[PDB]
Amino acid sequence: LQEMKDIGVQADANAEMRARERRDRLHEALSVNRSRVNQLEKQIAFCEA
């Protein structure tokens, strides 16, 4: 129980799956945004050349 206090995270199951969903969709959204930025940059290089 002292270890539970040390970690301090409230860590509820509802909160658990919710958090994992949030962060995973966040990862994938990040990756997609990075891809889109790269695509646009490539377009810009095309135009310049």
Added chain:
Amino acid sequence: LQEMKDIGVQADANAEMRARERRDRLHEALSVNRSRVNQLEKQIAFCEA
């Protein structure tokens, strides 16, 4: 100890640092590979146009 062996991880600090460093290096190398793919794709587009 039974829990240790059920997870089965050797849990030696030295191996821990070594494994983590190796995986981080692989992360960075893979990021380099993705970047390289990006630049070469840029070149493909330039040449084709």
Added chain:
Amino acid sequence: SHKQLATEQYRHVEMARELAEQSGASSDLETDHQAASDHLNLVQTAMRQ
């Protein structure tokens, strides 16, 4: 043709600038998402204990 070239140069500058902004954004998000996954693991451990 000179005027069109100058205009395209302007447009290119604008797009390149905004895309640099988006690249910085994506990197910051990457850091955020690393932290996110760490949090997920913490929560799972709290569940089990």
Added chain:
Amino acid sequence: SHKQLATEQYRHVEMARELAEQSGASSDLETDHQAASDHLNLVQTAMRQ
């Protein structure tokens, strides 16, 4: 002129037929490195235990 450009196109086709494979391999490696980081986290947890 006619004979130059076709050959150049074919060379570029080859280069793209390398880039796409590097890209797919890179994505798979990304998943693998995520799993590796998971193992790192397991070792981290095992330290305290």
